[PDB]
Design a protein around this motif. Structure first.
Motif, PDB file in Angstrom:
ATOM      1  N   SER A  56      -3.574  -5.916   5.620  1.00  0.00           N
ATOM      2  CA  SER A  56      -4.026  -4.739   4.777  1.00  0.00           C
ATOM      3  C   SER A  56      -4.033  -3.188   5.747  1.00  0.00           C
ATOM      4  CB  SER A  56      -5.391  -4.964   4.134  1.00  0.00           C
ATOM      5  OG  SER A  56      -5.397  -6.058   3.221  1.00  0.00           O
ATOM      6  N   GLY A 113       0.057  -2.777   5.777  1.00  0.00           N
ATOM      7  CA  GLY A 113       0.163  -2.468   4.364  1.00  0.00           C
ATOM      8  C   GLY A 113       1.640  -2.274   3.887  1.00  0.00           C
ATOM      9  N   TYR A 127      -4.357   1.954   3.898  1.00  0.00           N
ATOM     10  CA  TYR A 127      -5.704   1.661   4.555  1.00  0.00           C
ATOM     11  C   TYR A 127      -6.243   3.076   4.348  1.00  0.00           C
ATOM     12  CZ  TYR A 127      -9.629   0.421   7.415  1.00  0.00           C
ATOM     13  OH  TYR A 127     -10.670  -0.083   7.938  1.00  0.00           O
ATOM     14  N   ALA A 162      -3.057  -9.914  -3.545  1.00  0.00           N
ATOM     15  CA  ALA A 162      -4.413  -9.252  -3.278  1.00  0.00           C
ATOM     16  C   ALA A 162      -5.711  -9.829  -4.043  1.00  0.00           C
ATOM     17  CB  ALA A 162      -4.015  -7.798  -4.233  1.00  0.00           C
ATOM     18  N   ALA A 187      -7.018  -5.001  -0.252  1.00  0.00           N
ATOM     19  CA  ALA A 187      -5.919  -5.369  -0.659  1.00  0.00           C
ATOM     20  C   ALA A 187      -5.504  -4.925  -2.208  1.00  0.00           C
ATOM     21  CB  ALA A 187      -5.980  -6.741  -0.578  1.00  0.00           C
ATOM     22  N   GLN A 220      -3.796  -1.601  -1.930  1.00  0.00           N
ATOM     23  CA  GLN A 220      -2.482  -1.992  -1.699  1.00  0.00           C
ATOM     24  C   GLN A 220      -1.598  -2.414  -3.015  1.00  0.00           C
ATOM     25  OE1 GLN A 220      -1.537  -4.404   1.650  1.00  0.00           O
ATOM     26  NE2 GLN A 220       0.475  -4.475   1.304  1.00  0.00           N
TER      27      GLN A 220
END
Lengths: 163, 163, 163, 163, 163, 163, 163, 163
Positions: free
Chosen positions: B49, B53, B99, C66, C81, C84
């Motif tokens: 993450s 990413g 992030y 996620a 997550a 993302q």
């Protein structure tokens, strides 16, 4: 100890040798000898790690998805999904580079002195519990030798490039 | 507090620095020091993450699949699958754009006034319980700056294009 | 009824409008207002089906992955997550073709006469419990109109080709 | 025995015949007749193995991900995700090569003599419990005939190449 | 920082000392300090093993059920269920017997010779009165000393009969 | 619309008031209004926590088991299992003690100073009679007041001994 | 090698013989020999079925819970939880009744003719006093002989009433 | 064929009639006829709901645990665990009360007007003595009639007090 050891061995060899037909034969032999489809599924996951590795990083997921079919639909459709996984791993590009790299790293950790973490590698935390990269003595150590197969072609090109 | 903090830090640094060999070394050091493979697996998910990413949105799945191997086969094949994940994340294209974008958005939500939802953004429901996009004051706000790495090359091209 | 309805609506709109920055803002607003990350995760899955669909059939898996991070690591890495995932769905090609196709098919099943299964479509079993394609009246019916986005480009070309 | 047998059969036929519209119709008919979405999901997994197989090895995962949506979000979003899976399998390249290969292998295991494992195929273990590929009589046996569809194009080229 | 691990320690000590009110205070402090509830959930499982053991075997299941609530419902219902598990563990009968038994057995397996499996206990028995479960060097060894608390009351009664 | 959230409220109030027949009526109305059974399943878990608590710790598991039936078997078996959970929760002994305990502890952790962890409770104890689990400012604080119902009968007996 | 399968056998025999201390010794030896704890966890489930059966139906759940701890928390907490399961199984009431019942029933289903389902037991009953559950050839057959141990005490009481 | 669904019916009728020996026979016949054990596992969950209900709420968990054994260990351990579940269900106290309660409530929700939620039961109460859980048209309605068997003995005692 394990009545299916020879059969599973022959299956493993056929998969690593990219022989899908013989792999299906040995798989069939195991089932007809009363062997469990998940006994084979667990060993398929081991083959993904040992013989395919990063040449096809999606192989793990194909084998887990076959197991999920067994778990949700049942034994007979499970058998068929695991057959599909066997064929996939048989025709996949092969590399034992990640396998042998890890084994080396692990043996070195066991045997070599417990060197301190170099101060500049300290304090790189993650969000977990609450909201030269080797020791100097081991400079230039290499465990991982990507092959020219599958996704390891690009990997090798990148690692060499940045070497 | 956490006996493995320095080791895990060195592992994190090696992964973010695309140094698979050193990552395998620090991973091996943790295991041989009695550290749990899932202690590392959880931190691998955090690295997916934080450092990979959207440069490789499949990285999360590789790390989860390694964990699934541990859960289904066991500790030793688990270790090997998590090694494969470490190598994958090490050689993956890197981006901390998602992030840092989230962190910014979250700090702004905490700090800025609680602006109403603009009326034209209301009533866009989903099938769930039964069968300018910013407030005006925040027009043009940008949190996400995709890099030129991995799948972020295309993303960046698309967002700029439609900017 | 649902304190977060407007916020979630604004989030949905930003995702469907390919506005990742505003999506992260509304997501942040929900969390800071005390909303649950899984409340948002469930609605993300609904957005994958409704707004992305077959333009990117892997979108479902990114959102589930996620959620798996939340389930295994915890709330804080989970949040990251899911961020993302929000960004992924925001920049993904969009198509509501599968959504509207299903809705139409379902309304027609409810409303139209219960026509027999044409005899030539009978007996096509599967391995499950043990080891014109429309009724004549509905010939030429079309529910699914693939767009020119993402993987729907190829799909559309194939369905037209074989039309 | 199974009130939905004809409907499910018509659904199967439409999917195997790459007719997404008719597949959605029969799916809708099942639901409106009171049939369970998971009754259909299990049969979708069987269709992935039987009719798509290695022409699209990701098809299994799309169908499992639809089921995961049902399991996590609920029945109504589940229905929609399973519709997306139906459409995916309908437009996917088709191959029953893995299906028929396994069936043959299994029937041969049942019927032919239980030949020994050739000694050179023995001892190929895996990390599991603790840290010619046919018998001579069956030399040249072939069960798997990849088609020219989807990922089976490359497979076929590779197996022929190494034949 | 180090102060964070002190909160975790205070929580563990309070649960172990059967102080549910203090346990809830330290949990609440952990949450307000940004601590992840799943990080807490993992420690609770270690507590069930180490401090409660077979005085209440259901303890393990209450803590797993709290984790399931977090994974399925979300963070806030999860934190509530974990609080319930904290109180459950705090008022449960305490026993460290299974924990110390396993540790003692491991030190013997590590420190004493790798004695042969007694002949009658082998997968294929061999010629030895074959009533011993320990190697003769370890005859009458006891690791497990059930307390007089919870389900161990009855276990201790039974083991004394056996002897 | 708002009428839908009224059905949910009626169901919650009926379960809490130990009115299983009315609870089943409101559930049935929710279903016929197009309400998702899993949406209901999530509320049931919140009810187990909020209204039943440690009067019956198994409550949590009955509601999770109903959810498992829905996930594994399907929607209709799921709705039946959820009805069983509704009746179970309706006739279960009720206690809000764990719920209100956790809320009171959170308000103290938020409203009062972040007192130091008493020295003896720290991960490494420091020089302080070290018998307190609360900071000295919070000495003898009680949050958790077990009812005289269900499993809390025995808990209340025990906590009074302890004091 | 073969010595490894001897450790597994010693562990099984010790649990079956209700020898928890020896069981923990053999487990510890298995671990120090490099044996996978999940390999052990799988054998424990087979033991719950074969050696404990319905003398304690909860046995199955204790061993599954230990596995859950391993999957969620990690290897070391897992090994501890599995030790707890080993002791649980060792001190549990033993019964092989369900195991031998199922085996006897399978041999009859394999060895005797495939008798027709009695008419009244058919999915659509047909003209036959329709009180038999067995085919008339198998009238009064008994496979299941509950012990006088654990939950089978009450079951044996009940089955004698029934007859 | 139709004969297969007759075996399923015989198994269901035997479990319902508390005939464990016949139940095991029909299960064994189902297996030898090529029937999938998970297909059987799904029917067992429906049986727990329909025929056992709240006479033994743990019934659901025994059948889910058997399924877990199949998913984690494999087909053969799974078939054994499912046999154990079959015997468990066969000797369990039987009650159809929860099943028929839910069906009656659904027919009322479908057949009678969609009465308003009583004002005091609404998410925001409105001006109405607000003691009714049913709409006034449905006052004193009873769907759920606990048997005198199993856990329903106590439930029936309690519901009579309440009234």
């Amino acid at each position: 100890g394990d009545r299916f050891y020879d059969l599973i061995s022959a299956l493993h060899k056929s998969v690593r040798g990219s022989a899908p037909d013989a792999a299906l034969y040995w798989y069939a032999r195991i089932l007809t000898a009363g062997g469990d489809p998940l006994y084979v599924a667990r060993r398929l996951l081991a083959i993904a790690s040992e013989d395919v590795g990063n040449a096809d990083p999606r192989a793990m997921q194909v084998a887990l998805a076959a197991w999920d079919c067994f778990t949700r639909v049942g034994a007979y459709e499970g058998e068929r999904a695991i057959a599909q996984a066997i064929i996939y791993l048989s025709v996949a590009p092969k590399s034992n580079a990640v396998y042998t790299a890890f084994n080396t790293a692990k043996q070195q950790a066991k045997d070599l002195p417990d060197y301190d973490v170099p101060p500049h590698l300290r304090n790189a935390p993650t969000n977990l519990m609450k909201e030269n990269y080797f020791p100097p003595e081991l400079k230039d150590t290499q465990y991982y030798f990507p092959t020219n197969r599958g996704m390891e072609i690009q990997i090798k090109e990148k690692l060499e490039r940045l070497r």
